[model samples]
Target: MEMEKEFEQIDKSGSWAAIYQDIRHEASDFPSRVAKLPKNKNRNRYRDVSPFDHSRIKLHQEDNDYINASLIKMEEAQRSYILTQGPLPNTVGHFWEMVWEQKSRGVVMLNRVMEKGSLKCAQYWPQKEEKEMIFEDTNLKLTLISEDIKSYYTVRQLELENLTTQETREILHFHYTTWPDFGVPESPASFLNFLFKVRESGSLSPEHGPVVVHCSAGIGRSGTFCLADTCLLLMDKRKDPSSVDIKKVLLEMRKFRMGLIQTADQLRFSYLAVIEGAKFIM
Candidate 1:
């Protein structure tokens, strides 16, 4: 009863706008260190996309290898995710280096290669029929073993190998191309189906490191995905859909990455998804 009371508080029509302000206020007050370091300035895909220094993922290279990425860890849910920007033309190799070093088993791409007739992300993988695409900068290779094209998403089996060491690992590419740059999905069922599709592959299992999640800026749609997944997991724990506090959970997640659940619609969509997803959990 109390949980429903708390949950219903945000169900009001204008409640999302109120919470949106709170999320923005929390994000605005946070410090940013973009371009503070000379080399990392251009590594970011977009001029506006930069990682928070406190939680930024620093490349293991000797120098000049930083990319806009963050390691988000949800201890209670035993989930670790790397929220990062889409790879730029120059940073593609660096993006792979982070995946290789971090031992990521999957990548959840939430945006298209081009939107509004402009490039949003690099075509960072080999084509469906291609054998392999090599990354000259990282001395690595990516091969497309197989691909499954669905109505809204595409699942590809990617084999990432280091040219020098010849070490290879299979990575699942879950690309939700239909989702607009900063918009929510068609319905919660559609989104949850994609979420479970990733879950079933064991890519999100704790045995692996973190699943890399990204979009154009890596904060808007990427943040919404992570927030929704985390909230659903929390609700499933106690078998009570309303047991979890959505706002608190989002704030906690923002501790690891800046600007999660970007817009008022995204926030409201999350609530809708959560309430509907809870039925699946039950």
Candidate 2:
């Protein structure tokens, strides 16, 4: 209660967004280039979703990259994350290819397959006991090796195979079902628990490739996910506890991906979660 109330005293307003925008304005010309790219202009799942061209995920064989996905590396925490929009009907193959090329061990999905009245993301993974779910565009095969369901989330074991090379790799899918598209989770307990579960799998560790984190737009909910992940990690990584600055931390994260922590409420919720999550960490 004390920390929650104190949170209300900080800078969370249009000014906050202004500060963010101002910083993002001078950050670079990358996002504008991504927006201007003729190829990516229509590839975005939504009209509003775009990535900073500097951080955008360049295809292994393409000239540069696509707009919907960005590879964000947090060197300080030694964590790499792919902040990407929910795959559209057409971009699904590219999504998995990014994963396959990056050797990502897991994907932290925050949006439901279907939201209030719209389809947020395509189901690119396999179904129950499925032999192999193939994506025609990339000649990729995804098999559901196993799944563990929880009250608020589901953990999936996936087998990703490349038909051309006859190569296969195991991937973990962490799906959080309770979070709405524009909202936070009901409580921090389940959310933090989910984070710990990901940590337990070593997906968030340096040993693995970047973990894919996404939502509908990739900025709103995906940014929130990245914020929490880094905050919790900085706390764990630091030699001192008082040095963690959520706002500055957010600005640092924004360097990798644009417009992190979408709304003031989302920002508030992030701090609340960070404050509450501190109990478990310290």
Candidate 3:
């Protein structure tokens, strides 16, 4: 006997709208770009601002100009500083490769040292430990300066050795009351506060000066911090804002550091945060 067919087909043309709605719902929850999207009519007028490049990541570099006290006559000397993803071994290794290629170099690894005690539930402590271990194993000595983010420096200075690690730590600290909302004014303010602290501490001089910065993948927060500092200094000299090219800045940085801003989100945040910082300084 022939077996009856078990499957059945139904006409569902009326359900097309429902299916489309379901897909739309799913896409709504997908990650969306916070950057201003190009207007369909004005698309040709706008330039590309996408954060990532298929060929290379972006970075920023600044020159250090500290004076040498040696009696022996020496030619001009300069130190190169750069923004980076973090002080992780892999990231630092890439930075060294780029530095060698540029014929410019870095000696100290300045990290944006945040206070672990301030982290909620110790969220950033593991990352701190991971960075410390990486530094310990590598020839580069990592320096953690309190970019005015927390109180670790004060406590450590007060003979808090049991908790403080042996790593070289800076004494200055910056404390911001609030963080920015949606990569706006708040984020820039936080970074500017850091830069101000660096300047106040007299650590940002070009001659034998500290390479000043903070980190967190070296893109969003760190990039904004470094750029805002440079931009403000330039502005003081009556330089036009157009002369402050972010892409050029990042390119110079890549000469010494790799993956300065490793993610699209970080890039967008850095751009927005710098705009806010620039506006505030102006």
The C-alpha lDDT values of all candidates are 0.82, 0.78, 0.34
Indicate the residue-level lDDT of 168 in model 1.
91
Q: Model 1, residue 23: what's the lDDT?
A: 73
lDDT computed for candidate 2: 0.78
Per-residue lDDT tens digits for candidate 2, residues 85-146, read 88887878888888998888989998888988878888777777746778887788888999
Worst 10 residues of 2 by lDDT: 1-10
Best by lDDT: 1
Backbone collision tally, model 2: 0
**Candidate 2 RMSD to the real structure:** 3.1
lDDT of 3 at 6: 9
Worst 10 residues of 1 by lDDT: 27-36
CA lDDT of 47 in candidate 2? 66
List model 3 lDDT by residue over 1-282, tens digit each. Answer: 100110011012334334324323332121112213333222111122222222222223232111100011101122223333333322343333333222321221223333333321111112232243222212233323222236222211101011223433232323233333233343445445555655655445554323423343334445445544554555455435545544445444433333344344444445555555656665
The model with the greater TM-score, 1 or 3, is 1
Model 2, C-alpha of 126: deviation from truth (Å): 1.8
TM-scores of the candidates in the order shown: 0.92, 0.88, 0.40
